[PDB]
């Protein structure tokens, strides 16, 4: 029973086409940002897995942690 | 390098067609030249003069060709 | 030219027509407007905000369509002289809306 | 293994290659593909490959390396000592691509002309194509800071081939129809000093180079031919006699004279080689001595990364410093595409008859 | 029918040589390389001088270097070139004759070809002959496993390995130089040793005898500040990476100063930071500091202001050589450094080694140190360069000896017994491999002939006697009286060599010549 | 000045018919002669050097053909076949060509007669069709039998596969290696798994197969020598994420007023990798491997903390490694767990040929090994690999199919006799084609005896005669220079190899036969 995931979307944090670069003003944002940067990607891919999707497809760019997460979730990928 | 070193060869239907084409050319350049209603043709010699005659032979007599069957 | 989506209806019995030229492709405003954020959460919040303008644009039509084509039988078609966002295309797609982009000015 | 510094010659090409955006760079993240920016681990200079952390020549082009090879690396090089050259090439790379895309639009719009309008303009004069400068490479670093120089390189194959094609084709359409570009200049030295900048053209601060200290996002600059365009005493006949390129450059199909642009992208005029040179090759109008300063930190880097006998070993007498100063005198030869020295000298119409403005690149009869 | 046709582009300039004519052609080429190298072997051998494309020169006896410098055009030659390169980094010298082994074998191999004999069997027998050689060789092999702390088997072996090199002037010293060097840095628990732990350092000038290994590390750097005192007795050492400047977070970072007090505090901080780390190191109790990167001229003086000399712009590998030799650590931070991480040594002193030059820095560490350097002085740059490679190579064989503590007296005795050992089998060979046997055996014979010819004696009058004694006697310890000493007991003459050296050597050679025999046809593109 | 209109572009060449067709037949015959000597236990190998000057030796003709940049078109088809068969089964690609040309060779005299090609290939398809099934009939399995270790035949297959390539005297050595090596490959069965290390120098008989993974690769970092190089029962850290202070992290400008805030920032910069390292040290691994570079500073910590680390690792060997110890490559240091942790019996790192290698194996649960290929010739390395790979892929097919046949040309002679008798069955024009079909068929031993320099005819006359009744697997012996049961002599080949060989050859000529003219465009 194959659960196929199809995305013209590339497998990366949805890059806003206009330039949002992180700017910080205090320290902890450094700690927080990349951690959450990881954290929500896990939440993104989990939300996918919550639906039981076992294979994901795209031609677009794949984020390494994202596939790292998919591998953590026993998921299949297309490129 | 084998046979005669820049001597071409040809064979078969292409050849036979070529002769036919060359043949067909030969007649038509003259097909108008016969009859009491014929035409009369004027020619450019190699050596400056002018010849006008209906008799095809002289017309052909003044013809330089490369195709052999034409010759 | 034709629709840019497979789910797009090839044929419609009764057509209600949208003639327009304003882009429903994304656009970013004419002024240099450099933004940042500090959170990747904002990054996604910045994702949704950017789309929202076109989101309303298409939203105005769909309500109108739904204000217009409350009946199921009627089919709704759109024509743009400029191009159309795929997300907008999807927006119409879920509503089964025929739309066309990039028409010659005449 | 032990490694040696590259010779000055290997540097010169890498310099020369850099201002053509064609430097081969090796990175752990991306390998040798520079589409996606990464910190350089190996680069090609001349025929050789060098470790960017020790600046010892770690290989050769023929050797077709797949990796930064293991060697006794001083690791004494920081990124900052060479990032400036890393800056110019990627900026060059982005610039040519934008320059590539722009000409195609004019060429596209040139060919989308119906015969009658060209027939009408050829006889009557008037605007034929006006490409909205708001459309000019709107996502690159020379138009908006939503981009950056680090941004992934727009993937374009046969870039020089297509650049050669579209320039030559576009010029022939102008050459055959003697049309009037508002984006061309008889001597790009004028673009920086001597021309009038009109209205909104005036903010321009010309760096004349590709460096991080420049603010390289800048407006698309073209000449203001509005006075010519709407002038009855400068109507169709007068412009044919004076304004069209072939008056000053010679006929595009029959001239070696380079054809240069207004500062379309990054406030940098382009230098297109003449058709009779065999190709229409594009260059930014940048002096070689400004090219050389891109390495001045690295020269110092070697000064404190390498021993003198090692430096003298690879650079010869004088080491890099005398080389650098010597190369500075030889930059007009060694860092100079000839096309930047092949512009016409007998000038009839020129560049100083109309101000440069910020506006739409356009062509009229 | 008959008419021209294209199979490969440039078919005109695709030349092609096939079969025996090609075979011998390669043999002809091979002999040239052999004859190129014959003179390069042995204490009486004479070494070659290469000229670089950029006009530089190099005189050397290491054939690997010779070929590495050699620019041939024949492809098989390059195979020989890399072949030696493969042997050298595998073992070392012996390369003095490695190729010479191959071609003479090939030279005689053609003799079999001249007998029409098919290469495949010729490939076959020689390999069998090769296996024959080694199992004979290691049987008659001596060992230095049986030896006590190996002080002067190695010295002899080093003495042996250096008699082929021009550095033989005082080679006894250098023999000692290496053996101390290797034993210090060796892992007997491992049977290996990394050559990185060895720092070769040769600066021109002085005599060859002025070459001196340094139980420590030498720095091609002077003092960070000229007023800092040249000598330092105590060696409380600081090893630093973070250059002595304001730290700058390498993510794109910048401050946006607005008001007066904004300026002042940073201006205030600007000096305040320097005092901090100046305090920081001072509190560590170190005596000397060293930095990989830059200094600020200000804090440099301030660092001089507290009698704590430091070193700036220190190359990577050496710093750890400093660290390990001191046993010291590498800290990237001021705060996180503590006295425990500090290096200690016996002595550090800069040396004005040049009469007219800038200077060098040496660290005469006095505790145990797994890294070490050798300092070479001498009269010519190339002479330095010859020494380095020669010295470099001598290290390997002792390393090679570390891997295997069983050796054989060199001087040509070893293989001599083998061909005899080979020959004895050749009678119980049976057929045509029988011819193959004596062929390779006859092939093997050349090396002593190379020696005695380079000895200027009658090669054959020598070995013929040499065999018969090793025929009459069973002692495989009679080589060539290379230095004209009436004793053939090379064991007493102490001319010795590791088992592997020859063992890999000929075994290497066999496989190559196998391929050499293996090919028949070549299609060369026209240049 | 009128001119006749040309048909196509000037110089658009055409040549049609018999003379056109035969030219390729000669051209194909030209091809084989460059490969004629090649295959055989006493066969041959070639060296070809590019116009670049990089020489290349080869014994596999397909490799040689790939070097042999053909300009004739029909020949390229031959070249293509090699790739297919090489992509299928390997050496005998050598043979594959010879069958192809020889079939064309004997057909050419009948091509002399203006025979419709469609007749010709019709028999070929049939002749091929019957042959395969007859081959299928005489296929040999062993799992039914008693005296086979499921590996013994594979060992037999390789020696047979091996006893032509450059290490032919070390087949009995390598055979065990690869058979043991292929044995660990279960069950993905792709070749990318096992690494090959063209380690320079050393005797090829010293070339090593390690029941694990190692690297020819490393790179100088600061303390990279300083940390211990022995790890007796280590726990394995495998990182893809780089380790350096935001060397290549997100593009980000920052704005900060208070100097101390700026103070705090760089600390926070360092606080990251310290936190990362804290994850790493607290993880319990001692060896850290990464495709990305490693910050020198962390290496000091690993070196200070008696853990090993490594950066710039190839992605490939990382996958091999993670596959080997079963550990999992990671990008998030926080989401770490010991489950993703490799463990090996031991870790080490060794010099070989001057080169800095890194050792770790003994992991009992690893479907991947690696090949240390000692060898003093640069040219040996790739060529052996070509041998090494070729051995691997075929025996994988051997594991794939319990189908073997004897070698030494016996099959082909066995085939020819069978068809030859079958030729009597069929009357008419086809019979000669069958007769020729069998006639070209026996080429294979003939090449052998040539490459052995033997009186193949007398052998062949002995061969066919003894192959009338006396036994199927009689065939050429090189050393005895005559007939022998090569099967009991363990000259054993997977059937599919020749099965595929003839099939591709059949279509080869069939494609070849199907051409009447050529058209050239500049
Ligand atoms: Zn380096």
How does C86-99 read in b/e, with b if 16+ C-beta sit within 10 Å? eebbebbbeeebbb
**Would you kindly state where each structural domain of chain E is located, as residue ranges?**
20-143+406-525, 144-215+371-405, 216-365
Please compute Rg for chain A using Cα positions: 14
Q: Based on the residue annotation, tell me whether F45 is a catalytic residue of this protein.
A: no
Whether F330 has its CB under 8 Å from any CB of chain A: the answer is: yes
Set of chain D residues whose Cβ sits within 8 Å of the Cβ of A17 = 146
Peptide bond just before F187 cis, omega within 30 deg? yes
Instruction: Report the structure determination method.
Output: cryo-EM
Asked if residues F331 and F254 have their Cβ atoms less than 8 Å apart, the reply is: no
Cβ neighbours around E275 below 10 Å, total: 12
> Measured between alpha carbons, how far is F354 from F375 in angstroms, rounded to an integer?
13
- Among F71, F200, F354, beta carbon nearest to E7: F71
Q: What is the 3-state secondary structure (H, E, C) of F306-337?
A: CCEECCCCCHHHHHHHHHHHCCCCECCCCCCC
E58 in catalytic set: no
Give the distance (Å) from ligand 1 centre to CA of residue C87.
48
Contact between F465 and F430 (Cβ < 8 Å): no
**CATH homologous superfamily for D1-90+287-336?**
Outer-capsid protein sigma 3, small lobe (3.90.1630.10)
Q: Exposed/middle/buried for F5, CB within 10 Å: 0-12, 13-18, 19+?
A: exposed
| Cβ neighbours of E3 in B, within 8 Å | 2-3
Continuous segment of H or E residues that includes residue E66: helix E63-69
Sequence ranges of chain D with CATH classification 3.90.1320.10: 91-286+337-365
* Cβ–Cβ contact D28 with F under 8 A: yes
Tokens 């710039």 locate to: F312
Which chains border E (3 or more CB–CB pairs < 8 Å)? B, D, F
> How far, in Å, are E243, E247, F308, F386 from residue E332 at the CA level?
9, 11, 19, 48
CB E132 within 8 A of CB E429: no
F163 is in an annotated binding site: yes
Looking up tokens 């205090």 gives A26
E95 catalytically annotated:
yes
Q: For the stretch F479-495, what's the b/e string if a residue is b when 16 or more beta carbons lie within 10 angstroms of its beta carbon? A: eeebbbbbbebbbbbbb
Q: How far apart are the first and last CA of chain C?
A: 15
Give how far Cα B58 sits from Cα of B48, B62, B63, D16, D133, Å. 16, 6, 9, 74, 75
How far does residue D40's CA lie from ligand 1's centre (Å)? 12
> Which among E500, E503, E480, E504 has a CA at the least distance from the CA of E490?
E480
Contact A36 C40 (CB under 8 A): yes
What is the CA(D55)–ligand 1 centre distance, in A? 6
> In a 3-state reduction of DSSP, which class is residue E237?
strand
Q: Which of E391, E400, E397, E352 is nearest to E372 (CA)?
A: E391
Chains with 3+ CB–CB pairs under 8 A to C are A, D
Which residues, including other chains, have CB under 8 Å from residue F471's CB and lie 6 or more apart? Answer: F485
| CA F220 to centroid of ligand 1, rounded, Å | 8
Closest Cα of chain E to D208: distance in Å?
25
E194 is in an annotated binding site: no
| CA E326 – CA E324 distance, rounded (Å) | 5
- Cα D335–chain centre separation: 13
Among the options F390, F477, F482, F485, which is catalytic? F390
Inter-axis angle of helices F429-441 and F117-137, nearest 10: 60
Gap from E4 CA to chain B (nearest CA, Å) = 7
Angle at F312 between CA F311 and CA F315, to 5 degrees: 115
At the top level of CATH, which class does the domain E20-143+406-525 belong to? mainly alpha
CATH number for region D91-286+337-365: 3.90.1320.10
Q: Mark out the alpha helices in C4-74 (DSSP H runs).
A: 40-68
**What's the topology of domain E144-215+371-405?**
GROEL; domain 2 (3.30.260)
Residue D45's beta-bridge partner residues? D48
Distance CA F177, CA F181 (A): 6
Cβ neighbours of A16 in F, within 8 Å: none
Alpha helices in chain D (DSSP H): 8-18, 83-111, 115-124, 159-177, 189-192, 226-229, 236-242, 246-249, 288-292, 296-305, 308-315, 319-334
Classify strands A55-57 and A76-77 as parallel, antiparallel or unpaired.
Answer: parallel
**CA-closest candidate to residue F465, choices F479, F449, F482:** F482
Q: How many angstroms separate the alpha carbon of residue F266 from the centre of ligand 1?
A: 27
Q: How far apart are CA F13 and CA D270, in angstroms?
A: 45
Asked if F378 reaches chain E (Cβ–Cβ under 8 Å), the answer is yes
Residue D73 contacts E where some CB pair is shorter than 8 Å: yes
- Which residues have CB under 8 Å from A21's CB, separation 6+? C36, F250, F251, F252, F253
The backbone torsions φ and ψ at residue F312, rounded to the nearest 5 degrees and listed phi first, read 65, 25
* Chain A interface includes D72 (CB < 8 A): no
Spatial CB neighbours of E264, under 8 Å, sequence gap ≥ 6? none
Q: Please, which residues have CB within 8 angstroms of residue E292's CB and are 6 or more apart in sequence?
A: D76, E240, E241, E243, E313, E314, E315, E316, E319
Indicate the SS3 state at residue E127: helix
Using CB atoms, list chains with 3+ pairs below 8 Å to chain A: C, D, F
| Strand D221-223, strand D356-358: pairing | antiparallel
| Breaks after residues in chain A, judged by C–N over 2.5 Å | none
Q: Is E187 a catalytic residue?
A: no
Biggest distance spanned by C-alpha atoms of chain A: 50
Contacts of E4 in chain B (CB under 8 A): 1-2
| Cα of F219 from ligand 1 centre, angstroms | 9
Instruction: Report the Cα–Cα distance between both ends of chain D, in Å, rounded.
Output: 66
Choose the catalytic residue: F38, F63, F77, F93.
F93
Helix residue spans in E242-311 (DSSP H): 260-284, 297-304
Burial tier of F57 (Cβ tally within 10 Å: 0-12, 13-18, 19+): buried
> Which is it for strands F235-239 and D57-60: parallel, antiparallel or unpaired?
unpaired
Is B35 flagged in the annotation as binding?
yes
The residue behind tokens 């405003």 is: C29
Of D73, D79, D304, the CB nearest to E316: D73
Q: Can you read off the two tokens belonging to residue C99?
A: 């739309």
- Measured CA to CA, the distance from residue F106 to residue F438 in angstroms comes to 10
> In angstroms, how far apart are the furthest CA atoms of chain F?
104
Joined together, the tokens standing for residue F45 give: 């190998």
- The crossing angle, in degrees rounded to 10, of helices E446-454 and E19-38 is 40
Angle between helical axes of E98-114 and E499-518 (0-180°, round to 10): 40
Which secondary structure element, helix H or strand E, spans residue F66, and what is its range?
Answer: helix F61-67
Residue intervals in chain D for CATH 3.90.1630.10:
1-90+287-336
Q: How far is E316 from chain D (nearest CA, A)?
A: 5
Q: Whose CA is closest to E345, among E360, E359, E362, E332?
A: E362
CB F344 within 8 A of CB A77: no
Query: Which helix (DSSP H) or strand (DSSP E) does residue F429 occupy?
Result: helix F429-441
In degrees and rounded to multiples of 5, residue E475 shows phi and psi of -80, 115
Cα separation, D47 vs D59, whole angstroms: 9
- Residue among D164, D127, D349 at smallest CA distance from D245: D349
Indicate if the alpha-carbon torsion angle E485, E490, E491, E496 is positive or negative.
Answer: positive
Q: Rounded to whole angstroms, how far apart are CA atoms C34 and F429?
A: 84
């Amino acid at each position: 029973d194959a659960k196929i995931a199809v995305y013209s979307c590339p497998f990366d944090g949805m890059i806003t086409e206009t330039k949002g670069t992180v700017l910080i003003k205090t320290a902890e944002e450094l700690m927080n940002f990349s951690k959450g940067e990881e954290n929500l990607m896990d939440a993104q891919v989990k939300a996918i897995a919550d639906t039981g999707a076992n294979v994901v497809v795209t031609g677009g760019k794949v984020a390494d942690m994202a596939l790292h997460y998919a591998n953590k979730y026993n998921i299949m990928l297309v490129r | 390098l084998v046979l005669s070193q820049n001597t071409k060869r040809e064979s078969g239907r292409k050849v036979q067609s070529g002769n036919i084409n060359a043949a067909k050319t030969i007649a038509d350049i003259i097909r108008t030249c016969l009859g009491p209603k014929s035409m009369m043709k004027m020619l450019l010699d190699p050596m400056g003069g002018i010849v006008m005659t209906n008799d095809g032979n002289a017309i052909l007599r003044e013809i330089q060709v490369q195709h052999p069957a034409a010759k | 030219h034709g629709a840019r989506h497979p789910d797009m209806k090839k044929r419609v019995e009764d057509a209600y027509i949208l003639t327009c030229n304003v882009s429903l492709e994304y656009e970013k405003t004419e002024v240099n407007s450099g933004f940042f954020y500090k959170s990747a959460e904002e990054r996604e919040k910045l994702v949704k905000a950017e789309r929202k303008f076109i989101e309303d644009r298409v939203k105005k039509i769909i309500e109108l369509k739904r204000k217009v084509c409350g009946d199921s039988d009627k089919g709704f078609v759109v024509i743009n002289q400029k191009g159309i966002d795929p997300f907008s295309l999807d927006a119409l797609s879920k509503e089964g809306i025929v739309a066309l982009r990039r028409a010659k000015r005449r | 293994m032990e490694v040696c510094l590259p010779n000055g010659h290997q540097v010169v090409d890498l310099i020369n290659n850099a201002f053509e955006g064609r430097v081969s760079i090796y990175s752990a993240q991306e390998g040798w593909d520079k589409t996606i920016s990464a910190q350089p681990d190996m680069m090609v200079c001349g025929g050789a490959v060098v470790c960017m952390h020790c600046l010892g020549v770690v290989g050769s082009l023929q050797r077709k390396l797949k990796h930064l090879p293991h060697h006794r690396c001083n690791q004494q090089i920081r990124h900052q000592d060479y990032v400036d050259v890393q800056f110019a090439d990627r900026v060059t790379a982005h610039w040519k691509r934008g320059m590539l895309s722009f000409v195609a639009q004019m060429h596209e719009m040139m060919n989308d002309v119906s015969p009658d309008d060209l027939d009408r303009v050829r006889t009557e004069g008037g605007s034929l194509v006006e490409l909205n400068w708001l459309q000019v490479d709107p996502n690159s670093m020379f138009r908006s800071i939503h981009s950056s120089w680090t941004d992934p390189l727009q993937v374009v194959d046969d870039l020089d081939t297509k650049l050669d094609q579209y320039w030559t084709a576009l010029n022939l359409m102008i050459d055959s129809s003697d049309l009037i570009p508002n984006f061309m200049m008889r001597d790009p030295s004028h673009a920086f000093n001597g021309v009038k900048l009109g209205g909104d053209a005036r903010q321009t601060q010309f760096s004349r180079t590709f460096d991080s200290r420049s603010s390289l996002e800048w407006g698309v600059m073209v000449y203001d031919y509005s006075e010519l365009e709407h002038d009855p005493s400068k109507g169709r006949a007068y412009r044919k006699e004076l304004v069209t390129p072939a008056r000053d450059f010679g006929h595009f199909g029959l001239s070696h004279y380079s054809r240069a642009t207004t500062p379309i992208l990054g406030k940098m005029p382009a230098v297109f080689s003449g058709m009779l040179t065999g190709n229409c090759k594009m260059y930014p109008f940048i002096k070689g001595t400004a090219k050389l300063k891109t390495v001045r930190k690295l020269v110092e880097a070697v000064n404190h990364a390498w021993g003198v006998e090692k430096i003298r070993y690879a650079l010869g007498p004088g080491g890099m410093t005398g080389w650098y100063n010597r190369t500075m005198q030889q930059a007009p030869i060694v860092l100079t595409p000839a096309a930047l020295t092949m512009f016409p000298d007998t000038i009839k119409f020129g560049d100083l008859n109309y101000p440069v403005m910020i506006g739409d690149p356009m062509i009229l009869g | 029918y008959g008419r021209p046709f294209l199979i490969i582009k440039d078919q005109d300039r695709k030349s092609r040589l096939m079969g025996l004519e090609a075979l011998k052609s390669h043999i002809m080429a091979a002999k040239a390389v052999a004859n190129t190298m014959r003179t390069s072997l042995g204490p009486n051998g004479l070494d070659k001088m290469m000229v670089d494309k950029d006009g530089d020169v190099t005189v050397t006896n290491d054939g690997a270097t010779i070929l590495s410098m050699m620019d041939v055009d024949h492809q098989i030659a390059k195979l020989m070139v890399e072949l030696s390169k493969s042997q050298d980094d595998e073992i070392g010298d012996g390369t003095t004759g490695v190729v010479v082994l191959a071609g003479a074998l090939l030279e005689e191999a053609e003799q079999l070809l001249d007998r029409g004999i098919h290469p495949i069997r010729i490939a076959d027998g020689y390999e069998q002959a090769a296996r024959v050689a080694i199992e004979h060789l290691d049987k008659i092999s001596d060992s230095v496993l049986v030896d006590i702390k190996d002080t002067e088997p190695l010295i002899q072996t080093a003495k042996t390995t250096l008699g082929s090199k021009v550095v033989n002037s005082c080679h006894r010293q250098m023999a000692e130089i290496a053996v101390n060097a290797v034993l210090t840095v060796a892992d007997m628990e491992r049977r290996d040793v990394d050559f990185e732990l060895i720092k070769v350092e040769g600066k021109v000038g002085g005599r060859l005898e002025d070459t001196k290994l340094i139980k420590g590390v030498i720095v091609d750097k002077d003092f960070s500040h000229p007023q800092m005192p040249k000598k330092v007795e105590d060696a409380k050492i600081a090893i630093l990476t973070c250059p002595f400047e304001p730290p700058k977070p390498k993510t794109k970072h910048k401050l946006d100063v607005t008001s007066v007090e904004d300026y002042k505090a940073l201006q205030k901080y600007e000096k305040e930071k320097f005092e901090e780390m100046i305090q920081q190191i001072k509190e560590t109790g170190a005596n000397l500091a060293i930095c990989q990167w830059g200094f600020d001229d200000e804090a440099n003086h301030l660092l001089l202001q507290n009698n704590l000399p430091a070193v700036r712009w220190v190359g990577g590998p050496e710093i750890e050589l400093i660290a390990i030799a001191t046993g010291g650590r590498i800290v990237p931070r001021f705060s996180e450094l503590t006295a425990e991480k500090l290096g200690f040594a016996g002595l550090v002193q800069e040396i004005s080694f040049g009469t007219t030059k800038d200077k060098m820095l040496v660290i005469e560490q006095c505790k145990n140190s797994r890294a070490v350097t050798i300092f070479i002085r001498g009269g010519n740059k190339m002479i330095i360069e010859e020494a380095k490679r020669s010295l470099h190579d001598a290290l390997c064989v002792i390393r090679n000896l570390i891997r295997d503590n069983r050796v054989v007296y060199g001087g040509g005795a070893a293989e001599i017994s083998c061909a005899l050992a080979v020959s004895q089998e050749a009678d119980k060979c049976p057929t045509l491999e029988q011819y193959a046997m004596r062929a390779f055996a006859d092939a093997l014979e050349v090396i002593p002939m190379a020696l005695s010819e380079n000895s200027g004696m009658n090669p054959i009058q020598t070995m013929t006697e040499v065999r018969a004694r090793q025929v009459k006697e069973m002692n495989p310890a009679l080589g060539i009286d290379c230095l004209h000493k009436g004793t053939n007991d090379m064991k007493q003459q102490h001319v010795i060599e590791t088992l592997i050296g020859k063992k890999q050597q000929i075994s290497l050679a066999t496989q190559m010549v196998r391929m050499i025999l293996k090919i028949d046809d070549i299609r060369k593109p026209g240049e | 000045m009128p001119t006749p209109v040309i048909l196509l572009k000037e110089g658009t060449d055409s040549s049609q018919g018999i003379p056109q067709l035969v030219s390729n037949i000669s051209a194909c015959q030209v091809i084989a002669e460059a490969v004629r000597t090649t295959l055989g236990p006493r066969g041959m190998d070639k060296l070809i050097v590019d116009g670049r000057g990089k020489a290349t030796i080869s014994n596999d003709g397909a490799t040689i053909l790939k070097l042999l940049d053909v300009v004739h078109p029909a020949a390229k088809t031959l070249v293509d076949i090699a790739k297919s068969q090489d992509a299928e089964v390997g050496d005998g690609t050598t043979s594959v060509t010879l069958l192809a040309a020889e079939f064309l060779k004997q057909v050419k005299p009948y091509v002399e007669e203006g025979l419709h090609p469609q007749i010709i290939i019709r028999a070929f398809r049939t002749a091929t069709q019957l042959a395969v099934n007859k081959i299928k009939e005489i296929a040999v399995t062993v799992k039914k039998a008693d005296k086979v270790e499921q590996r013994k035949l594979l060992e037999k297959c390789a020696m047979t596969a091996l006893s032509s390539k450059l290490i032919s005297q070390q087949k009995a050595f390598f055979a065990k290696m690869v058979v043991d090596a292929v044995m660990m490959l279960d069950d993905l069965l792709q070749l990318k798994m096992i690494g090959i290390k063209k380690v320079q120098g050393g005797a090829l008989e010293d070339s090593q197969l390690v029941a694990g993974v190692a690297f020819k690769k490393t790179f100088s970092y600061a303390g990279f020598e300083m940390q211990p190089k022995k790890y007796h029962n280590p726990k394995i850290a495998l990182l893809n994420v780089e380790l350096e202070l935001k060397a290549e992290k997100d593009n980000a400008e920052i704005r900060v007023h208070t100097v101390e805030d700026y103070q705090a920032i760089v600390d926070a910069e360092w606080n990251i990798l310290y936190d990362k390292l804290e994850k790493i040290h607290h993880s319990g691994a001692k060896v850290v491997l990464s495709k990305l570079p490693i910050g020198d500073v962390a290496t000091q910590y690993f070196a200070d903390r008696d853990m090993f680390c490594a950066g710039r690792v190839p992605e490939e060997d990382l996958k091999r490694t993670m596959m080997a110890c079963g550990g999992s490559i990671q990008t998030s240091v926080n989401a770490l767990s010991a489950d993703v942790l490799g463990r090996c019996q031991v870790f080490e790192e060794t010099q070989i040929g001057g080169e800095r290698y890194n050792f770790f194996t003994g992991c009992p649960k690893a479907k991947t090994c690696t090949f240390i290929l000692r060898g003093g010739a640069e040219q040996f390395m790739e060529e052996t690999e070509r041998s090494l790979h070729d051995a691997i892929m075929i025996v994988r097919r051997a594991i794939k199919n319990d189908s073997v046949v004897a070698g030494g040309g016996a099959i082909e002679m066995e085939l020819s006799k069978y068809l030859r008798d079958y030729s009597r069955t069929i009357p008419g024009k086809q019979q000669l084609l069958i007769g020729a079909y069998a006639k070209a068929l026996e080429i294979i031993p003939r090449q052998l005896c040539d490459n052995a320099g033997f009186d193949a005819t007398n052998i062949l006359n002995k061969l066919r005669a003894r192959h009338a009744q006396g036994g199927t697997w009689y065939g050429v012996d090189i050393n005895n220079e005559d007939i022998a049961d090569n099967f009991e002599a363990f000259v054993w080949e997977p059937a599919m190899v020749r099965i595929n060989a003839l099939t591709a050859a059949s279509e080869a000529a069939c494609l070849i036969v199907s051409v009447d003219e050529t058209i050239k465009n500049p």
